[PDB]
Design an enzyme around this catalytic site. Structure first.
Site, PDB file in Angstrom:
ATOM      1  N   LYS A   1      -3.814   8.724   2.402  1.00  0.00           N
ATOM      2  CA  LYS A   1      -4.752   7.727   3.035  1.00  0.00           C
ATOM      3  C   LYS A   1      -5.018   8.868   4.411  1.00  0.00           C
ATOM      4  CE  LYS A   1      -7.405   6.575  -0.313  1.00  0.00           C
ATOM      5  NZ  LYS A   1      -8.792   7.457  -0.215  1.00  0.00           N
TER       6      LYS A   1
ATOM      7  N   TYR B   1       0.769  -1.289   0.419  1.00  0.00           N
ATOM      8  CA  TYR B   1       0.142  -0.108  -0.194  1.00  0.00           C
ATOM      9  C   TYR B   1       0.545   0.913  -0.165  1.00  0.00           C
ATOM     10  CZ  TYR B   1      -4.204   2.608   0.919  1.00  0.00           C
ATOM     11  OH  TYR B   1      -5.357   3.494   0.526  1.00  0.00           O
TER      12      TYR B   1
HETATM   13  N1  LIG Z   1     -10.668  -0.129  -4.989  1.00  0.00           N
HETATM   14  C1  LIG Z   1     -10.443  -0.134  -3.541  1.00  0.00           C
HETATM   15  O1  LIG Z   1     -10.636  -1.306  -2.940  1.00  0.00           O
HETATM   16  C2  LIG Z   1     -11.062   1.041  -2.429  1.00  0.00           C
HETATM   17  C3  LIG Z   1     -10.887   0.039  -1.110  1.00  0.00           C
HETATM   18  C4  LIG Z   1     -11.310   0.993  -0.005  1.00  0.00           C
HETATM   19  C5  LIG Z   1     -10.989   2.231  -0.478  1.00  0.00           C
HETATM   20  N2  LIG Z   1     -10.584   3.279  -1.171  1.00  0.00           N
HETATM   21  C6  LIG Z   1     -10.325   4.525  -2.293  1.00  0.00           C
HETATM   22  O2  LIG Z   1     -11.717   4.757  -3.347  1.00  0.00           O
HETATM   23  C7  LIG Z   1     -11.618   5.842  -4.115  1.00  0.00           C
HETATM   24  C8  LIG Z   1     -11.216   5.591  -5.620  1.00  0.00           C
HETATM   25  O3  LIG Z   1     -12.086   4.749  -6.965  1.00  0.00           O
HETATM   26  P1  LIG Z   1     -11.936   2.833  -6.281  1.00  0.00           P
HETATM   27  O4  LIG Z   1     -11.509   2.262  -5.332  1.00  0.00           O
HETATM   28  O5  LIG Z   1     -13.014   2.768  -7.268  1.00  0.00           O
HETATM   29  O6  LIG Z   1     -11.477   2.665  -8.476  1.00  0.00           O
HETATM   30  P2  LIG Z   1     -11.125   3.581  -9.293  1.00  0.00           P
HETATM   31  O7  LIG Z   1      -9.631   3.361 -10.396  1.00  0.00           O
HETATM   32  O8  LIG Z   1     -12.302   2.528 -10.641  1.00  0.00           O
HETATM   33  O9  LIG Z   1     -11.904   5.004  -8.853  1.00  0.00           O
HETATM   34  C9  LIG Z   1     -10.370   5.600  -9.302  1.00  0.00           C
HETATM   35  C10 LIG Z   1     -11.101   7.531  -9.473  1.00  0.00           C
HETATM   36  O10 LIG Z   1      -9.841   8.188  -9.160  1.00  0.00           O
HETATM   37  C11 LIG Z   1     -10.118   8.997 -10.432  1.00  0.00           C
HETATM   38  N3  LIG Z   1      -8.670   9.623 -10.237  1.00  0.00           N
HETATM   39  C12 LIG Z   1      -7.539   9.991 -10.192  1.00  0.00           C
HETATM   40  N4  LIG Z   1      -6.784  10.951 -10.426  1.00  0.00           N
HETATM   41  C13 LIG Z   1      -7.315  11.539 -11.007  1.00  0.00           C
HETATM   42  C14 LIG Z   1      -7.511  12.997 -11.205  1.00  0.00           C
HETATM   43  N5  LIG Z   1      -5.636  13.818 -11.289  1.00  0.00           N
HETATM   44  N6  LIG Z   1      -8.475  13.651 -11.482  1.00  0.00           N
HETATM   45  C15 LIG Z   1      -9.695  13.421 -11.390  1.00  0.00           C
HETATM   46  N7  LIG Z   1      -9.933  12.040 -10.553  1.00  0.00           N
HETATM   47  C16 LIG Z   1      -9.065  11.225 -10.453  1.00  0.00           C
HETATM   48  C17 LIG Z   1      -9.822   8.708 -11.275  1.00  0.00           C
HETATM   49  O11 LIG Z   1     -10.303   8.657 -12.703  1.00  0.00           O
HETATM   50  C18 LIG Z   1     -10.955   6.911 -11.043  1.00  0.00           C
HETATM   51  O12 LIG Z   1     -11.906   7.886 -11.389  1.00  0.00           O
HETATM   52  C19 LIG Z   1     -10.183   6.050  -4.148  1.00  0.00           C
HETATM   53  O13 LIG Z   1     -10.150   7.283  -2.554  1.00  0.00           O
HETATM   54  C20 LIG Z   1      -9.015   5.016  -2.992  1.00  0.00           C
HETATM   55  O14 LIG Z   1      -8.756   5.466  -2.126  1.00  0.00           O
HETATM   56  C21 LIG Z   1     -10.684   2.080  -2.744  1.00  0.00           C
END
Ligand SMILES: NC(=O)c1ccc[n+]([C@@H]2O[C@H](COP(=O)([O-])OP(=O)(O)OC[C@H]3O[C@@H](n4cnc5c(N)ncnc54)[C@H](O)[C@@H]3O)[C@@H](O)[C@H]2O)c1
Lengths: 258, 258
Positions: free
Chosen positions: B163, B156
């Site tokens: 975070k 991570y």
């Molecule tokens: N993936 C997991 O299992 C998980 C676990 C718990 C917490 N989180 C959090 O959930 C959120 C992430 O979404 P996800 O996990 O559904 O995957 P995801 O890749 O589908 O979504 C992530 C988003 O972050 C966006 N992003 C990255 N850089 C960017 C920028 N410069 N401007 C605008 N948008 C930007 C991407 O476009 C994307 O839509 C984050 O906060 C992540 O840390 C994720």
């Protein structure tokens, strides 16, 4: 009556004057037998450090800019030209634009956030990974943090996510280096009197509040911190890594004033 | 038949495809009555978002690069040319270099650290400030986080202090804005099969470990997170601000397997 650091040598970063936390630590670590090397951030500082360092048997002073990785590479190059080995590191580096430590947190500027992160958090990662390379038989390191990372302290602003991440990286570093018998801990100090007032606009207030409402009814001293550091950097704390150790006269435990 | 979001308008940040957390959230929020605006990062994402957004009755899509202050300004201009006022924000955005989500945390480079911090942490502060201006009678926002901020999860790496800083700023933002009856909370989700999820090495192992060892022995669904978001964003959570809410089928409470 303590010499548990007899024969041990280490690095002290963060001294700015005789009121610095890093200095209280330095005094206590030396009284316990340590040889000290120091870094210094600027000339005025170096000129104040020189006499200070002398009173703990040390002329080993090396300037450094914690914002520049080359500077830090050089810091370890200069260290290495006297010591092939290191036993401990003290990281007490905290910086942010003090003019932005007022009003609401949302006024934190992007550049101040970046710079505060760089200096107040990532520098520890930098230094730790350089220093580990000089600890072939294990060793110990500490950073300094404040309870304002996890509960909201007014004005603290940009410092807050920086410490929070410092505390996070502390734990990750401990896991990284744990197999090498290197221990990585943090000291969450309470406000230090007089020091508090110069670091942030409401420092006096924060300190007075802390003394009125801590179970012990006093603020932590530089020496308190020095002794806790002595504990976390000696064999005494052998069962302890990745710990956010609270040394604030128990202020953190009280939920509200009596 | 829920409709507690009847007549509410909100911004959804972070949809990348139909597996994205922000998308699950958008689906349940819309099915509870909310009109939705969306921000997207790139052109491929936009092409994928158009059909989806259509299924929740929206064509309100705006590009936004969150490491560009100008672009977030433009985002809120484009919002205001349609809505003078806004009820909620969902912030579901993360980034870090896939390559550095491997190996020991200390190999985390300075640049990836600055960038991970800007996109994963400070972008929420950025968004919160602008959005707040659209909530003159209050409202609710959430961001997303993961338990890896505070307990060590292998690989991570840079995401962890990011975070942690994010959880910190959440609480600080909560204090800045509570006088305006704007609530700011975060959801700490368990592992979900997503696009950014597949950046982490051995996330498959992580998800399987978290499912096997959770009290409920299941993984959180996009709908679970969506429903906890509905809670955190409606009148239901009117006594809740500054909270890091665990929605991980209770993984965080178990100390070791049985
Ligand atoms: N993936 C997991 O299992 C998980 C676990 C718990 C917490 N989180 C959090 O959930 C959120 C992430 O979404 P996800 O996990 O559904 O995957 P995801 O890749 O589908 O979504 C992530 C988003 O972050 C966006 N992003 C990255 N850089 C960017 C920028 N410069 N401007 C605008 N948008 C930007 C991407 O476009 C994307 O839509 C984050 O906060 C992540 O840390 C994720």
């Amino acid at each position: 009556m303590i010499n548990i650091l007899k024969g041990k040598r280490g690095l002290i970063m963060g001294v700015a004057n005789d009121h610095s936390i890093a200095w209280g630590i330095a005094k206590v670590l030396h009284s316990a037998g340590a040889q000290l090397a120091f870094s210094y951030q600027g000339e005025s500082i170096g000129k104040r450090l020189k006499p200070l360092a002398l009173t703990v048997d040390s002329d080993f002073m090396i300037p450094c800019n914690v914002e520049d990785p080359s500077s830090m590479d050089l810091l370890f190059e200069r260290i290495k030209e006297r010591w092939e080995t290191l036993d401990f590191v003290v990281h007490s580096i905290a910086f942010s634009d003090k003019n932005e430590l007022r009003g609401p947190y949302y006024n934190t500027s992007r550049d101040n956030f970046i710079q505060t992160m760089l200096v107040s958090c990532f520098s520890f990662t930098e230094i730790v990974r350089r220093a580990a390379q000089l600890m072939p038989h294990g060793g110990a390191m500490i950073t300094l943090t404040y309870g304002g990372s996890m509960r909201v302290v007014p004005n603290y602003n940009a410092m807050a996510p920086a410490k929070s991440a410092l505390e996070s990286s502390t734990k990750y570093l401990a896991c990284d280096y744990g197999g090498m018998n290197i221990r990585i801990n943090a000291i969450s100090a309470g406000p230090v009197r007089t020091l508090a007032g110069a670091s942030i606009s409401n420092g006096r207030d924060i300190a007075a509040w802390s003394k009125e409402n801590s179970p012990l009814k006093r603020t932590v001293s530089l020496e308190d911190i020095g002794n806790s550091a002595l504990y976390l950097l000696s064999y005494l704390s052998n069962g302890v890594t990745g710990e956010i150790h609270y040394v604030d006269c128990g202020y953190n435990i009280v939920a509200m004033p009596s």
